């Protein structure tokens, strides 16, 4: 896995990532990265990347809804632990 740090300019700012679950395997996955958003401008994240944790909260067997809640909860810093096939 690897580390990605994204910073929100305001607490309600979205990262511009759509997350999905899959019927056939556990995990929270990147469906797409919105053009011009925080994640796109940072540049590292790719579609199909798996989000393993956000700010130290485990998402290996978690849900996109939990991910959204955790991303919102941070005032600014969003530390993602990510894996890529």
């Amino acid at each position: 896995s690897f580390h990605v740090i994204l910073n929100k300019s305001s607490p309600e700012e979205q990262l511009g990532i759509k997350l999905v679950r899959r019927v056939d395997e556990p995990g929270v996955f990147i469906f797409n990265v919105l053009n011009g958003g925080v994640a796109d401008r940072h540049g590292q994240l790719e579609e199909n990347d798996r989000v393993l944790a956000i700010n130290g909260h485990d998402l290996r067997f978690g849900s996109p809804e939990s991910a959204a809640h955790l991303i919102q909860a941070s005032e600014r810093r969003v530390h993602l632990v990510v894996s890529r096939q």
């Binding site: 990532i17 759509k18 997350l19 999905v20 797409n32 996109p64 809804e65 991910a67 959204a68 991303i71």
Partner: peptide, 4 residues
Amino acid sequence: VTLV
């Protein structure tokens, strides 16, 4: 999908 869930937007974050």
